[PDB]
Structures are given as structure tokens and as C-alpha cells.
């Protein structure tokens, strides 16, 4: 096709145009509408993606399962884009319901531009972060954390029901990141886990930071770092990169996590 070629050139906006016009010449084509929905989630236009998902259900009710599932993912992703300011997340951090306040106040300050409280909140959250050693790709590391200062010792998950979860890396027992088997799955990757407070389960993990803006960042084809003001608070853009031990590792090179247990606890 042509849009599938514009997407190879890292051109997200162009790829969308080639699709919107493509459905105008064949509005009764599922594959086109479907491909247009995936590239809509990557762009972040959730309101539109949802609009298209409601239409495809009417036109192709035979694909309700998949369309519905995407609706849930779009909902979770919407709650996350909103959490970047207001409370709309279900974080299983634990009993420290005080930390949950710190996380929400961190974003509330990011928007209120009070970079003095963000600098203070960031340090407090990191101070409370329970360091936990992990086995990453069968290699041992004494500690793991996201480089991003907003996420810190947390991973993100989009549950099946359509809820956005913030889960302490320290609460993870096993984690498996699958390979993408679809366009959208490249940035919203299916994962199999086993974390304290949820047991064995599955969902999707956004593979890119919430602030990603360029088309290369949304596609997860690069990682940039913007410093807040003059503090040591650095947010991310594009593909996530994690600090494992003493090195930096892009999330795309992480297949599995196996927590280092202390025989006596389990």
C-alpha cells in the first residue's frame, strides 16, 4: 500500500491521511478502519479512536471482541493521560496511602508549575522507594528503576477491564514482555505478570512515556530527555529506558523480570 510505506519513514501524520482518504474510497472495509484505529491510539487521539471503534462495531459486529478490547485500552490510556494531572489511576503501591498522595501532587505541581514542590516530591518518593533486586534476561542486578522521574520505581499497566494501574516495581515477582504482533502492540505491549496484590494476571504496558510528542517518540523510535527547570527532575519522551544495576536498558530489550527472593519469605 502507501500508508504502510509512510509509516516506515516514521511519518505518523502522513500515514493517517493515507488511511482517512483510503476509507473514503472503500468505507465498508474493516481492515482499513481497523488499521486507522491502531495508528490513532499511537498518536494519542483517544476521543477519535473511540469514535471509530464505536462505528466499526455497528458496521462489523462480528469483530466486537477485538473492538471492545481496544475500547478498554483506549479508556485506560485516557485515564493515564489524565492522571498526568488529576486522580484517575488505581495504584497498588500498598498500604502507604500517603505515597499515593505524593504521586498525584507531583503531577498537580507539574501543571501548576511549582517546580519547587516537584523537586521535593520527587526526592521524597525516591527516598521511600523500596530497592529490589531483579533477574533481567537471566542476568542478576541489585536494583531496577525507570530512568524517568515521574514513574520512578513504578511500572504502568492497562488492565483488561480498562483500568490504568501504577504498580511498584518492588511488588513484581515475575514479568514477561511479549513481542508485538500488531502495529499498536508495538507501543501497548501485551504482558504476563505476577505481582503482589494482583496475583497472576495479564494486561498491556504502555511502551512509551506519557509526554512523548513527536511522531518518532509516539512510535517509540527514539528516547529524549527534557529537564524540568533547574532541578534534577528529568521526564521522558519516547521509548522507555530503565536503570538496571549500573547500566541503562531500553524497555524494548527487556523480555522477562524475575524478582530476587529472600528464602524465608516464599
XYZ file of C-alpha atoms in Angstrom:
266
model
C 0.000 0.000 0.000
C 1.078 3.630 0.506
C 0.311 4.406 4.162
C 2.266 1.294 5.196
C 5.206 2.957 3.447
C 4.695 6.338 5.102
C 4.789 4.521 8.449
C 8.208 3.046 7.584
C 9.507 6.581 7.066
C 8.462 7.359 10.620
C 5.684 9.541 9.240
C 2.697 9.058 11.556
C 0.636 12.067 10.487
C 1.036 11.217 6.784
C 0.177 7.558 7.430
C -3.136 8.701 8.936
C -4.019 10.856 5.905
C -3.406 7.936 3.561
C -5.900 5.948 5.660
C -8.650 8.523 6.158
C -8.717 9.053 2.392
C -8.456 5.289 1.820
C -11.691 4.588 3.698
C -13.470 7.315 1.703
C -12.871 5.142 -1.373
C -13.948 1.997 0.499
C -15.935 2.872 3.696
C -17.105 -0.720 4.024
C -13.590 -2.082 4.561
C -12.813 -3.399 8.053
C -9.020 -3.769 7.632
C -8.654 -0.106 6.673
C -10.792 1.231 9.528
C -9.018 -1.165 11.915
C -5.544 -0.053 10.808
C -6.717 3.558 11.151
C -7.720 2.896 14.799
C -4.321 1.462 15.739
C -2.416 4.447 14.361
C -4.910 6.675 16.194
C -4.003 5.239 19.596
C -0.303 5.726 18.854
C -0.999 9.381 18.031
C -2.857 9.704 21.304
C -6.112 10.944 19.772
C -8.246 8.762 22.040
C -11.533 10.636 21.552
C -11.310 9.920 17.796
C -10.049 6.328 18.167
C -13.043 5.623 20.373
C -15.370 7.224 17.802
C -14.010 4.868 15.134
C -14.279 1.886 17.486
C -17.969 2.612 18.057
C -18.574 2.742 14.293
C -16.704 -0.457 13.446
C -18.929 -2.261 15.970
C -22.043 -1.141 14.115
C -20.556 -1.946 10.734
C -18.777 -5.157 11.704
C -20.438 -6.506 14.900
C -18.692 -9.799 14.167
C -15.471 -8.205 15.453
C -16.975 -6.907 18.705
C -14.474 -8.787 20.918
C -11.447 -7.084 19.418
C -13.156 -3.703 19.041
C -14.378 -3.844 22.641
C -10.935 -4.789 23.950
C -9.451 -1.728 22.187
C -12.162 0.407 23.780
C -10.931 -0.727 27.193
C -7.304 0.005 26.271
C -8.267 3.450 24.982
C -10.109 4.081 28.251
C -7.125 3.034 30.391
C -4.827 5.158 28.196
C -7.202 8.048 28.659
C -7.144 7.706 32.441
C -3.323 7.768 32.235
C -3.202 10.880 30.094
C -5.499 12.412 32.687
C -3.555 11.108 35.660
C -0.737 13.331 34.387
C -2.700 15.934 36.413
C -5.802 14.593 38.217
C -6.580 11.362 40.088
C -7.750 8.630 37.699
C -5.416 5.727 38.465
C -5.599 2.603 40.628
C -2.127 2.234 42.094
C -1.369 -0.930 44.045
C 1.550 0.742 45.787
C 0.424 -0.759 49.075
C -0.652 0.488 52.466
C 1.314 3.732 52.121
C -1.781 5.651 51.023
C 0.349 8.710 51.777
C 2.631 7.924 48.842
C -0.398 7.876 46.549
C -0.969 11.486 47.578
C 2.644 12.353 46.783
C 2.335 10.837 43.264
C -0.816 12.804 42.395
C 0.551 16.031 43.971
C 3.682 15.556 41.819
C 1.590 15.934 38.650
C -0.608 18.626 40.208
C 2.589 20.626 40.748
C 3.968 19.824 37.285
C 0.930 21.564 35.832
C 0.824 24.365 38.449
C 4.466 24.904 37.505
C 5.539 24.812 41.164
C 8.830 23.118 40.280
C 9.914 23.616 43.881
C 7.401 21.068 45.152
C 8.096 18.673 42.257
C 11.778 18.731 43.233
C 10.795 17.977 46.830
C 8.177 15.352 45.981
C 10.497 13.547 43.594
C 13.179 13.145 46.282
C 10.632 12.021 48.906
C 9.139 9.369 46.589
C 12.633 8.097 45.684
C 13.531 8.042 49.382
C 10.551 5.784 50.060
C 11.260 3.589 47.012
C 11.975 0.084 48.237
C 15.075 -1.039 46.352
C 14.561 -4.539 44.924
C 16.989 -6.743 43.023
C 15.910 -8.454 39.827
C 16.990 -11.046 37.319
C 16.678 -9.372 33.914
C 17.001 -11.657 30.900
C 18.582 -14.250 33.223
C 21.188 -11.683 34.424
C 21.386 -10.557 38.054
C 21.050 -6.856 39.010
C 20.887 -5.443 42.573
C 18.290 -2.822 41.643
C 15.826 -1.722 38.957
C 14.006 1.541 38.323
C 12.651 3.633 35.430
C 15.024 6.490 34.482
C 12.005 8.834 34.208
C 11.448 10.762 37.481
C 7.656 10.617 37.277
C 7.457 6.806 37.050
C 10.468 6.104 39.289
C 10.053 2.698 40.873
C 6.716 2.091 39.137
C 5.556 0.295 36.008
C 2.326 1.047 34.176
C -0.386 -1.412 33.177
C -3.626 -1.163 31.271
C -5.945 -3.841 32.704
C -8.474 -5.788 30.642
C -11.394 -4.054 32.338
C -9.895 -0.799 31.093
C -8.266 0.498 34.268
C -4.876 2.277 34.414
C -2.590 0.740 37.067
C 0.604 2.049 38.693
C 2.457 -0.857 40.234
C 5.646 -0.652 42.339
C 8.478 -2.466 40.569
C 9.224 -3.813 44.079
C 5.816 -5.541 44.050
C 6.750 -7.557 40.956
C 7.557 -11.261 41.279
C 7.608 -12.257 37.582
C 7.152 -10.138 34.451
C 7.167 -11.081 30.796
C 7.077 -8.660 27.895
C 5.807 -10.273 24.715
C 6.797 -9.399 21.180
C 4.430 -7.135 19.267
C 2.206 -8.936 16.819
C 0.464 -5.836 15.544
C 1.165 -2.157 14.874
C -0.407 -0.747 18.055
C 1.055 -3.522 20.201
C 4.471 -2.016 19.415
C 3.760 0.758 21.984
C 0.996 -1.003 24.049
C 2.652 -4.377 24.641
C 0.892 -7.469 25.995
C 2.482 -8.629 29.226
C 2.121 -11.616 31.547
C 2.876 -10.892 35.195
C 2.597 -11.994 38.831
C 2.679 -9.057 41.218
C 1.786 -8.793 44.898
C -1.783 -7.573 45.248
C -2.983 -8.929 41.887
C -1.562 -12.452 41.733
C -1.047 -13.977 38.288
C -2.563 -11.923 35.500
C -2.170 -10.129 32.201
C -2.586 -6.756 30.567
C -0.791 -4.197 28.434
C 2.102 -1.911 29.315
C 2.494 1.398 27.518
C 5.967 1.089 25.937
C 6.395 4.879 25.567
C 6.345 7.800 28.023
C 3.138 9.772 28.562
C 4.699 13.078 27.481
C 6.001 11.776 24.135
C 5.158 14.394 21.462
C 6.993 13.873 18.153
C 5.952 11.114 15.793
C 9.231 9.314 16.490
C 8.502 9.389 20.233
C 4.937 8.128 19.811
C 6.153 5.338 17.543
C 8.778 4.514 20.151
C 11.634 5.030 17.701
C 13.710 7.279 19.934
C 14.136 8.405 23.527
C 14.627 12.077 24.506
C 15.004 13.676 27.950
C 13.694 17.087 28.978
C 14.777 18.631 32.268
C 12.027 20.379 34.250
C 13.545 23.671 35.404
C 16.904 23.670 37.137
C 16.200 20.701 39.399
C 17.292 17.087 38.993
C 13.838 16.068 37.725
C 14.012 14.584 34.210
C 10.883 13.417 32.369
C 10.959 11.142 29.351
C 9.824 11.189 25.751
C 9.521 8.174 23.501
C 10.720 4.615 24.251
C 11.212 3.870 27.963
C 14.779 3.220 29.177
C 15.308 1.631 32.634
C 18.232 1.764 35.025
C 19.129 -1.870 35.812
C 22.000 -2.095 38.222
C 24.583 0.296 36.742
C 23.500 0.383 33.092
C 20.628 1.872 31.047
C 18.328 -0.558 29.212
C 15.581 0.281 26.719
C 12.298 -1.389 27.654
C 12.216 -2.997 24.200
C 15.263 -5.079 25.155
C 13.607 -6.412 28.278
C 11.908 -9.814 27.905
C 11.439 -11.014 31.497
C 11.895 -9.970 35.103
C 12.391 -12.475 37.941
C 12.482 -10.970 41.465
C 15.318 -11.949 43.791
C 13.539 -13.674 46.697
C 14.801 -13.998 50.264
C 14.214 -17.663 51.122
C 12.157 -17.381 54.301
C 9.514 -15.132 52.739
C 8.492 -17.523 49.967
